[PDB]
Design a protein around this ligand. Structure first.
Ligand SMILES: CC(C)=CCC/C(C)=C/CO
Ligand SMILES: CC(C)=CCC/C(C)=C/CO
Ligand SMILES: CC(C)=CCC/C(C)=C/CO
Ligand SMILES: CC(C)=CCC/C(C)=C/CO
Ligand SMILES: CC(C)=CCC/C(C)=C/CO
Lengths: 362, 364, 362, 363, 362
């Protein structure tokens, strides 16, 4: 256990088999749930104190909520004694996701007044996936009408487009964004016996054409239908997120590219004890751009069962953030990026996107 | 010891107030802070002005509690010293009036829950308001708020009757035992004033919170319960337990007597060769006063409610001296309050006559 | 003349006999009238730059204007060459008093939309007294209709109440507040031959029951009719203000209590050269509470002809405030309280409230 | 010789009209006024005030900043025929900016009314009317002629209606400076149109010489207030300097009578006769009290009266401490000593006399 | 390669022939496109985070967008592999140009509510040129209706004016402004076979009368039709911009004046290694006024094939701005003027305005 580490990689990977989260994961759930008013999952109301205190930019809140929700879904699978709590937190997550503070950028930017409108898949992909995970975890049909509506809408946009997929916002196509939307269709299908996921094959064929560099195992940053343009930089954070979710739908896809991804972006250092991830090609700098390459690669390592890389990345990410546990609750004095506690929480618990799809009922 | 530095009066003096029919000079000085200076004192005006709270930096969500806990302390002041009863009644009138201002309840609307704070399931607000209505009337005899009191009491009772679980949610899908304890205690107060039996629901509630929401070995309640999912948050909470046991002791003394010693074994750290004490907020930590930071302060109230002079003295030796009290121009100020609701809770604990004694308050 | 003093006490007390204000009082009038835009009596408009620059809290502005006006009424008596100027300033005073910035707390607090409504005697006592003093000084009937209306309203509230007097705001009765209101009735009577002042005897009998401690010569802070409560602290600032105004209506009342008041509250120090006033009993601290005990005692000493105490108090109050005269205008670098230049101005010129009532016409 | 911290000699400023050229430092001030995109004050006719935001001009002062610039521009036109078109362009902008709510809106914010042309807002409308006139004298353009005729008629009607001679600057506040502007605007209208609105001048000059002036001291009292009859009992140098300067264009003998007394009363010569500064009122040794503009308006007055010695003295006091620099042929002051600082120094440097503006040859 | 320089002048000038941008130009395109939310060309929405982070004043945003767009048009010509990206960025440029944040000064100033009105050529000149360049680069007819409308409007204002050209805003005529508007007509003509550019000869004859000093090779600052005034100062930034654009329409015009311009304004220093430009006559100070003389002269040097001057100017401009390349993206720690990264970007890639007109189709 190096300084600034709270539990072993062996312990994180064993949680599901031990049917128990680690004490530091429990302490993160406490940060999430414990203190009146200021904890993020205190209330279903449209209050965002936790996010104001962390200085989360408004455009990032929707992602904070989503990534917490994805971690909570794995908490439910890990420990049956925590499943009701996870379900409660997911209920709040969905409820908060619907507040104008979360989606309102859509209106402030002049795109429209309803966030469910065409082509806002940034928001509505995550929301749809969250609707599905909430239902898988709890059995509650509270959001089932909305879930069915949003699923139909997403499917209809896919059907209507000459390219395979949907734009994340107007004329901007991102593979990560799509991966969420498609994964939400798999979740709906699991709940309802439908075949919305049929579209997945065409999408996976398409993203393997101009959107990926197959030698390097890396996706380009974005695609823009109106002009045909593919932005000419490859992106590690983009690729890590996309491969992780894709591995739940078509495991062979991600298994093909994962080793090349690592050759391309991952720098191992400190005599093999640590790793950090370059955000693009043609640089030695780690964690450029949005600063999330290492954190999303941590999730990916977990999704691929790569314990060595997980340990290396977490040795780089966690200690400088200066974790402490005060009154059985986890705080980081110096988080190194946006979405920091969210992504470390997620990666520590992540049971695999395929396992979430196959979650036994309650 | 007897008077350590940073202490203003002995525990023996606080406990003797009711028998001496007089508050201590420091309690008088706290009433001065509350009443003296034009505009900026908290109980200066019935209007919707909150300067005292702005100056203390009270967060808006906490104002309702500040007002309530001041009111509970005022109710005991009335019992202590008949010469101060009219003043207490005046301050309670102002308390109730301020409680009704949008600055106090408006979070309900800002959060998107609704436009009327008396609506279903806002018992965080309306529990305290109902209890205050009742205490105002017990202290003064005034029927000024009787109509509103009857209405709010009927509403609360109806929500209890309608729920499959025993009790009411503090806000949607969040059930807190402390919150319920206030609501139920308000029903006892209404019944005292009017001969009704709204308090009949108490037995079912006490059975429910015991079967399910307490760890009986540790003498501690879990943090919250959430009906839609069935979830009980898996941490025990000292502040939650201290507040709940204190109010419960006024309705069913045996309940609190059963758990109080275990509560102390679980949460209370005695230190400094028995002279001091501080309270851990949850299990599995050595840190004192985590979470909302009110474990010690609510335990101080509990100790007073249970007649535990030793623990009271220990807690107050921990809480009061670091806050650096001073009396300037016969008025009490704390240079370094250690928590939210600091002067409110210390005031309350210093005067608290017992929730049962408030129920049995003689008329004026 | 100690350092930080501008004229002798003998000079202040001699102004009326010399028919001239002191140069420092002239310099205060200059502060009040000279500089474009920023002087307080520059304009009848609803502009409050002078008060913004002094940092006057909004609740205090109504008192600032009133106390300036009371000093101006004495300026008019002192020096016939300045009476037109004083009258002009009083006109502006009355006009500014009617602006929403001054009275608008009544609305912000939720009490009502019209400040003349029942039970806002904090505002309407001072306004009614000002209306009267304006007319005594000038002979103008500009405000006579409003004056008659407000006088009738105040009289009706007194008649309607089971206790003698009116509340300053709902359920809060203050003797100072009443003293202003009753003094406004004396002024109306002087201008119109009416007997609104008949109510005074009942009020003076009442305030001498629970409201005063007759041994200590001090009023309690406030009275609250709904509950019957009298706040159990005595207040120097309250008593000093009330005795001063009462001395204009019933001189014997104030003569009875004045010496006891001084025993109770006034601390003489610095080998008899200085004095300061304790705000309540059971403390050695001076000028606690609102911080106006010494300043109102200065006014009281002037009202009672107590030259020694006046000199002592002013030796305490003025020098630390660091007066200077620049371009024949008076500035205090370090005013020690709210209402600082207002109350020192007033006390320096105050001819006695009785003398104001007996002001010869123009 | 050039005294320390000065940009040009007094002899050079006074010679501009005869040389038919402004001095280089005046050119540099015109550059500050006109050169840089967006932030120069005379860049745009739009309701943008960046130049004033950068200088920290209080909003109540903007109307005066614009007016005093315009008066200087009118003299630039007379000085150098090659700059007359530019001056006329700047005056067009001046008038246009003067009509923006940012400039006049205090009238509304103070609760007096919603229209600044109303009644009794002669602080604003005096200057506006004078500017309308000067714009037309400089350019020949009839762009604002309708508005000019309307505002002139209004001003004349208020004078006719008042029992006292003149108009109040705002309600119940009468200021002689304010009136001087209004009356001067009537002379300008009469010059353009052959009318006799100026007939009211004599009655006004007789009136201001009664309670409003101390004739021994050559100084006006601060203000007069009709409703009460009050005259504020302090004399004011800035008030007097401004009033005498404008009055000299209508009745030169009036200002010649009082000017020497004014100087005895207020002007302190110091530094072995090289410098001067002006006391704002009586009974003080302090210079430039009150609004802080006594010296600056006296500088204008000295120029109006041909008093080269006093001009030189005042400018030796005013300019060097303000630390002028010329960067990229444009003038900035690092430490302006008062409000309206660059405006009044500009004006005084170019001022051809208010009478000379009235008799400006056409283009 | 001096310190603070990223590539040689020989390398910038060779880009078109090598069919590749320099690595530092790639890094600038990364700053423009890479990071989610905060990059300037991330989104077509009305969000201006990139400009908020750079502290761009609102009145300058329209020019920032325009000058970026002009550089993008040359990127398209340089590297066919980047042409789709450039087209995408131009689409966004146009879309952002239409947001009220960009044009709203027109309304705030009281001129009107529609920025296409009459006489707002500062905005609509650039918008029209951008419409054209977008279509040249992409072949997309997305804006063709608006382009045709705006071109007609501009042409109609030229036809209606007694002087040759249009005012940039009411009564303010600027030659730079006109040069943009006229160049937009050439672009429209190239796309549609029309002859809107016929008006150019009259305009070029007119600007050579009072508007230029032909000995000094320099334009006066502005012209004002209502009064006939020409502001009597010459301006280097004005002249550099105008001559650069004019060289695309009538090369001989700019060839005539360019050497005189350099004599008048350009100071070579540091033993010939550097140059800086005076903004007006009668000063030794460089980069006065708006502070853009050197930057626009850098563009002009590029337009005229003057490699020596380009190298000299860039040795003055770039090193003090402290460029760094972090994660393959270009940032300047200390930009020396407004529009700094925009104008250096433009000048580094600029292929010539004539070459843009003759851009081969896609
Ligand atoms: C999380 C951050 C800082 C960027 C995400 C980029 C994007 C548009 C994803 C779509 O779901
Ligand atoms: C007063 C504080 C800081 C916490 C208590 C909040 C709560 C859920 C009360 C239930 O009546
Ligand atoms: C002036 C200050 C600080 C308090 C005045 C108190 C009051 C209620 C007076 C009524 O005329
Ligand atoms: C320019 C400044 C500071 C004062 C002049 C104020 C006034 C009453 C003008 C009358 O036209
Ligand atoms: C870009 C900057 C600081 C000024 C531009 C001046 C102008 C009116 C151009 C018209 O296209």
């Amino acid at each position: 256990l190096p300084p600034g580490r709270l539990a072993t990689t062996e312990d994180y990977f064993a949680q599901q088999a031990k049917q128990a989260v680690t004490p530091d994961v429990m302490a993160q759930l406490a940060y999430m749930n414990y203190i009146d008013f200021i904890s993020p999952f205190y209330s279903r109301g449209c209050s965002f104190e936790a996010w104001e205190l962390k200085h989360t930019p408004q455009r990032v809140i929707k992602y904070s909520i989503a990534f917490y929700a994805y971690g909570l879904a794995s908490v439910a699978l890990i420990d049956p004694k925590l499943r009701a709590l996870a379900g409660h937190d997911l209920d709040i997550a969905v409820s908060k996701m619907k507040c104008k503070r979360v989606w309102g950028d859509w209106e402030e930017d002049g795109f429209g007044t309803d966030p469910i409108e065409k082509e806002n898949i940034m928001y509505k992909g995550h929301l749809n996936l969250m609707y599905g995970l909430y239902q898988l975890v709890t059995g509650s049909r509270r959001y089932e009408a909305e879930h069915a509506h949003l699923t139909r809408i997403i499917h209809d946009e896919i059907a209507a487009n000459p390219f395979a997929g949907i734009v994340c916002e107007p004329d901007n196509y991102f593979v990560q964004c799509n991966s969420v939307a498609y994964l939400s269709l798999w979740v709906y299908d699991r709940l309802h016996g439908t075949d919305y996921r049929a579209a997945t094959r065409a999408w996976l064929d398409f993203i393997q054409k101009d959107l990926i560099d197959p030698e390097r195992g890396a996706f380009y940053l974005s695609y823009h239908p109106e002009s045909g343009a593919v932005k000419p930089w490859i992106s590690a954070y983009t690729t890590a997120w996309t491969l992780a979710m894709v591995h739940g739908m078509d495991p062979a896809f991600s298994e093909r590219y994962y080793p090349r991804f690592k050759q391309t972006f991952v720098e191992v250092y400190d005599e093999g004890r640590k790793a950090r991830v370059r955000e693009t090609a043609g640089t030695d700098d780690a964690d450029g751009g949005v600063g999330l390459a290492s954190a999303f690669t941590l999730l990916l390592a977990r999704e691929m069962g790569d314990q060595q890389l997980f340990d290396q990345l977490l040795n780089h990410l966690e200690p400088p953030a200066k974790p402490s546990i005060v009154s059985a609750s986890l705080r980081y004095e110096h988080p190194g990026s946006l979405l920091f506690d969210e992504l470390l929480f997620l990666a520590k618990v992540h049971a695999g996107f395929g396992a979430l799809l196959r979650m036994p009922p309650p």
